[PDB]
Design a protein around this ligand. Sequence first.
Ligand code: F43
Ligand SMILES: C[C@@H](OP(=O)(O)O)[C@H](NC(=O)CCCCCCS)C(=O)O
Ligand SMILES: C[C@@H](OP(=O)(O)O)[C@H](NC(=O)CCCCCCS)C(=O)O
Ligand SMILES: O=S(=O)(O)CCS
Lengths: 442, 442, 548, 263
Amino acid sequence: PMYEDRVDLYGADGKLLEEDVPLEAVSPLKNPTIANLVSDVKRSVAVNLAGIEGSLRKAALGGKSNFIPGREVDLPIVENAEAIAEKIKKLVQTSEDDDTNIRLINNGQQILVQVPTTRMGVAADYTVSALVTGAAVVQAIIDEFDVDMFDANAVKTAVMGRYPQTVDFTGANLSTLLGPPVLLEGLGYGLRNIMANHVVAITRKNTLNASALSSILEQTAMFETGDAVGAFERMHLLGLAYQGLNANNLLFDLVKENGKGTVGTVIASLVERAIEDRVIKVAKEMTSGYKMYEPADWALWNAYAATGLLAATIVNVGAARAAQGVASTVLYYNDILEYETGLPGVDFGRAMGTAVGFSFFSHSIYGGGGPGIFHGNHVVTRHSKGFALPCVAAAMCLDAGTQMFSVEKTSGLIGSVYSEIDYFREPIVNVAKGAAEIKDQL
Amino acid sequence: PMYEDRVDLYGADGKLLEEDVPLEAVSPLKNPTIANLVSDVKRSVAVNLAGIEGSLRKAALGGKSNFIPGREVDLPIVENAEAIAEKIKKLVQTSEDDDTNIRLINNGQQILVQVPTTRMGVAADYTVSALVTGAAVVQAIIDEFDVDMFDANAVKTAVMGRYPQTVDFTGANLSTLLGPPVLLEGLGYGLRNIMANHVVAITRKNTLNASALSSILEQTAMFETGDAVGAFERMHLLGLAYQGLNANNLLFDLVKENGKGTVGTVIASLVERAIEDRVIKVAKEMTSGYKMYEPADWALWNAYAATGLLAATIVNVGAARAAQGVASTVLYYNDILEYETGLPGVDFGRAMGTAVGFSFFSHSIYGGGGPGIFHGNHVVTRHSKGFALPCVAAAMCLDAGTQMFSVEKTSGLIGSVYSEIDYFREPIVNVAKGAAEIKDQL
Amino acid sequence: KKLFLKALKKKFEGEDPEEKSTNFYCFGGWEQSERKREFTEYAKKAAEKRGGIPFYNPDIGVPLGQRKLMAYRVSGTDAYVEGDDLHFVNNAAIQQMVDDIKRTVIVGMDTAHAVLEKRLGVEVTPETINEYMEVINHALPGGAVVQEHMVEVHPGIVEDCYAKVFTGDDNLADELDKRILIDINKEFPEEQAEQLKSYIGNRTYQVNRVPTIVVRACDGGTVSRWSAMQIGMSFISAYKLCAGEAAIADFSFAAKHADVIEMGTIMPARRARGPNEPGGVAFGTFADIVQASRVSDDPANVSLEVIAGAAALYDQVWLGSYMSGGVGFTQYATAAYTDDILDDFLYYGMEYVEDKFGICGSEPTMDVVRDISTEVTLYSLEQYEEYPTLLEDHFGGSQRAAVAAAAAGCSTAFATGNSNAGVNGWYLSQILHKEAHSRLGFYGYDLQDQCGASNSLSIRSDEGLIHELRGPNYPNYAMNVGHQPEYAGIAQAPHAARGDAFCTNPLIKVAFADKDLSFDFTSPRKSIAKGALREFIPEGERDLIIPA
Amino acid sequence: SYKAQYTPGETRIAENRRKHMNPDYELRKLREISDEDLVKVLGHRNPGESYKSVHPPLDEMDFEEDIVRDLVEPIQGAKEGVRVRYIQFADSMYNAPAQPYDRARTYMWRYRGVDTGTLSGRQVIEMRELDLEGVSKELVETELFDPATTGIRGATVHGHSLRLDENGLMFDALQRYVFDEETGHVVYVKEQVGRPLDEPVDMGQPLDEEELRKITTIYRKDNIAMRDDKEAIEVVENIHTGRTMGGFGMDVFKEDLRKRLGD
Ligand code: F43
Ligand SMILES: C[C@@H](OP(=O)(O)O)[C@H](NC(=O)CCCCCCS)C(=O)O
Ligand SMILES: C[C@@H](OP(=O)(O)O)[C@H](NC(=O)CCCCCCS)C(=O)O
Ligand SMILES: O=S(=O)(O)CCS
């Protein structure tokens, strides 16, 4: 292969999945599970039929506390969800043999619509899924009940919200994991737009699968932004493999041996492991006896450091079962690590800097919110190139109910709509199976 | 197939290409040529090596008339274009066997970079191609000349402009046919963002290939926005086939028989043809003898009407060999057609309405410009759902040199960079060959 | 009697309103006008300040005033003013109308109160809400509440800054300090009060008006932030919290995102603006901001008051400056609120509807839209044909097209109760007008009218949208004068005919039912008139911090 | 074969519109103007000066075969690369014999290589200047022009909607034409942007009111009301209804939808 690195892939239960795997087998550019996961995130649309119906019944149209008296339309949409879904299927598909998927959820109150890849292939960006799904839902409803021409625009408004007066689907009754590109902070940030509470809901609160899904999306986004190009590619792959996918069981063993420990003891365990594995070495011993270290392999040191970072998050937030401590943990893990060793911390300071602002904007009057609402497209937590947000996913799995903006409050139907998708819910085991499929092709 | 319609596909020379083709054989969802054209538009990036070099030499960084004295970097980039291109290839590709394409143009002063579909597949939107290409160019240059750490950020700024202080690549020395999605007017508008003058340069000023390329991109965008879904799909396919692709030679024959005629005589020829083909019929004869018509087939009437509109543009702008008249032509072709017949004009008024604003914003103080700078993502000319911009592409092919913002001024290198792509330059014949490839699979 | 005749008779004194001929070139040019003379005189007095730079000069370009330069009656008032006094730069009332909208945000209090009780174990009572409202009325205008060595904003320049609370819970309303209460039962007629409360429920909201000087120095995007910062400080102080703990971030997210109601939404990049700017105000949002609905049960009067405010907002300020600038678009807008001309046409249409269908007496059908729009358009055109002075008054085709179609569209909405049937009627009126006079408006006036019939009842992507929620960013509407103000009237019309308390949002409607606003939103006509007369005292001037 | 209809309507006003639009209807000449005087009032060039180009002769612009391009005959001004110039009219709403959309529709039926703009207060044609001068002569000499109610004006065009002056002429803030009281003729003393003419151009006598009521293309209650042309209104409503139905889509495209639904 291109790189010489090989790793063992271990599951979230700390047991070996795949032995002696070339690093590139988990590259977003090669792994077939990652490709399918990204395709599904882009093409999937949640249709809230119960919300469309109730919006229409009250003329509760176009967002928070809007009502248009006199424009109510009373239709039995949920009772006819099966017929409406069959119509949506006919309108969205490109052929009977394609990969269009329509699934009713929650007694027909919601639909998961997965738009065929043929439509994505001839579209410029991923908004096509929402747009095509919205058009099919509007026409399916109008046709199902023969909605008259003067009422039809209310159906349109119930489905897509205030668009096009708003730049997006404000107050709509459909949603996607990715928001429209007009709201992106950075070019190429589409995959970073999923709030941590949604990640937790998709993985049903399982700590390491949440942090894995976050790492997969973040690092795949780093390929999209051009950050994981050339000189930097190996750093991002090693980051994914170690911090996201529990390579060589390092993440799991660090937590296990520090289950009654602190952020400091996790640092000591990680530095010791890095010395044994010859990832770092002593550069100079100072007058006091202090040993200043240097990396022997900079991308691999960063990966070891990032793995200790996630382990420290799990130990310290796991001890509190309160997610607020996550920003502080990310901050002082890096701070202590640097002054313990003389080495650069995770992402060469950017994970620590991200945590400084994240701390401030989760404890102050100025903006932000609780940890669960942050994501890689948020101005506060965009700065680390994939190494910080997996900690927030892990932290919110471990919160036992201390948040006002909890998973239930922000993400209440996200589990029922998306978590039955195996690669979403259980990314580690399925990425490992993908790695096994291609390991001999690299 | 789904639809019963069949057409004969004729070339820009008015001669038969394919007989008895199912309508869906030219669908953006089915035709393999359209899929490949759209893929190439999304993945292609123009790298201006000469511009990067001169920008560095003068510290002319970050947009027009910027200079940063003292920060000049003097490098023989164009002299080493081959070596640099070979490095870009290694950085952009995902494997030696993939569809990465790097072509030096204009003695190495520009590079056409086509990013591999594998990278597009795991990215959320089409900006990946610019971002990855920019990252590869920056590293290739820094590595080729061992640019020192304090000068390196100037190379970055020379390639990508003022990003990220600007939301886009302001003042950059790379470009794409599609701008970044944060500048889209409407959701799904990515494919509509190509100015008419660029279309004219890509097709080397060949009238009907320009109008075809514009129609293909516009109508493919209507699939992306969800407008060509369900009830409306057939209207958009017939529009593409007749107005964009000279179905049944109707476009060509209308121009030919009116080469010494007027917008009015084109209308008379089109209405007569529509009566002959039983596309419209008399609904009521009025006291004065005036016959009010109705469509027998609404989507087909619209397609006939749209074809006459393009023919009228070619006749009336072609008579003047001056593109300014295009907006007036689109306006009054529709206005006269409606009062000649009682029928709705092209796109049920929206082509006419587009033309009113387009006339205004190409003759007033308030905005706009000459016809060559408009496109479907422009606030002025977004309103017709694919039926108006092909006229502007045709018109600028016919301009003999009356514009300040001419092709040469706005699009001076666009031909040398992109026009060698056969599908871009000659879309009609190649779409027909794609249709022949799949006609019996439908 | 025609409602515009009184104005014509004063505007064309000494002349028969029906006479087709007159004399021109006999007025002395610009010297016929008090205002033009004043302007020229100030231009000369400016010479020293400008140090030689040329300036306003009536001898540059067009010699204005070869015809008689008109005065205008502000409709529904007895104020007669020159057109220049209605230019938004010259009229402090118009500027304060916009500033009062830009500087208002509404924030739900129930989430913050849940954070206090559920997360912080702190009890919320009427007494603690009252104490909080007292604190935020010191903090919101720039007073310090926690830190030592704070500098503060001069209270003398922010006396217009304040916060109030309202609630759908009558039991809580009876317990809140009335100095800071917007009392729904006192501001609204009984039936409207009952309707508002059924939609608002047992929810509580604070209405924050940040200082006028702040939105003038900065922008509309400042407002939700400024409100949220001081809401946070006021919870910390009033409830005695640790001044910087995790729960505080919940108040922030609630006040800036989860529980905030802004007046306007953001623009796409080509016309980029933050929230609470005019392009982001939906037509139904503006109709709810205007307060004529709660003091008048005349649906024509209510719609006409909305159109007057919206002409100032959308045509004069938004399109005429934000999107263009210069001399701008005063008379494109004044045609819809002067000389009682639009009044005459709309009262004709309302009376035609009352007689033939009844107000709200028809379901929406194309037959009804065609009947009403055609009849009111013909009546309107005939008025310009019977009165040469009327046609010389509304001298620009755009003016005439907007006013005839406004009467047609509102009347159609009166009959059918459906705003989109109204706007379909507006599009019929425009193409009939065009075919009658063989002209319509300016070069690019009917872009949206030729696309309008098809998009009025469309259900597609960027075409379909219920009319109340369309606004200046609806794509067809994003460029041109002579439509947006009247569309606001069409959004109001079916709701005024029904007697609804609001068009789109009961929180917006209550939030402007407040005598302590500076601009009088119960009658935008009367306030604009007071500005035209130089009798309106705006907010935000800087006299206290600059030399005498 | 096909017989053009031009416009609906049962009244004299509609037939006047149809006559203007019909290329086989010969417009009556009411006056004559010399070539020199027409060029002088246009104001773009002096007579006798060579036509000025904006680009080289057309046969140097055609580098590549374009079969569709060569289907269309270029007008002579295009062949020669002559610059584009304009004429602009205001038409009084007191029954001027031509009116703004009437003009646009007439031009697009009768003339080749037209760029025409319609506004309430003026109507402009921009054309290769060589061909503009031929077209303009017809627009000034025929019943499309009345010197009292049709004003030639490229700037400061106010007046279409104003009362007529005491001599029956339309307002012109720049007074590009004046009434000669000695003769009763309307005389141009300025060209269409307002520069003074060295030599005034006589445009002859105004049409009388009764002739204007007979040949005008505007509807007015005091002459023939729009309300009276039930046929024209019926067709306008039909266009409106058809556009509404097409935008709504679901009924006119019902069979297209049924094929998409697999029904
Ligand atoms: C409530 C917060 C948490 C928050 O989000 N912002 C606060 C308060 C906010 C308020 C204080 C206004 C008031 O008193 O009503 C304002 C003025 C912003 C606003 N809403 O207008 C502000 N801080 Ni603060 N804030 C400041 C600062 C600071 C310094 C003060 C340190 C000290 O020893 O006094 C500390 C942070 C630190 O320790 O480094 C600080 C904290 C804090 N800052 C603590 C309150 C601390 C306390 O209880 O005393 N600010 C500064 O370090 C100087 C500038 C000063 C700002 C006002 C100005 O620039 O004039 C003010 C900037
Ligand atoms: C973080 C973000 O706030 P939100 O999390 O979006 O509410 C952003 N504010 C800020 O960056 C506040 C910056 C100024 C006050 C703190 C200065 S240290 C904003 O309002 O757009
Ligand atoms: C068209 C567009 O201008 P540009 O073509 O982008 O220069 C747009 N202007 C407008 O829409 C001006 C509208 C107000 C002036 C005309 C009113 S009829 C704008 O500035 O963003
Ligand atoms: O003359 S235009 O119609 O172009 C602008 C009028 S304000």
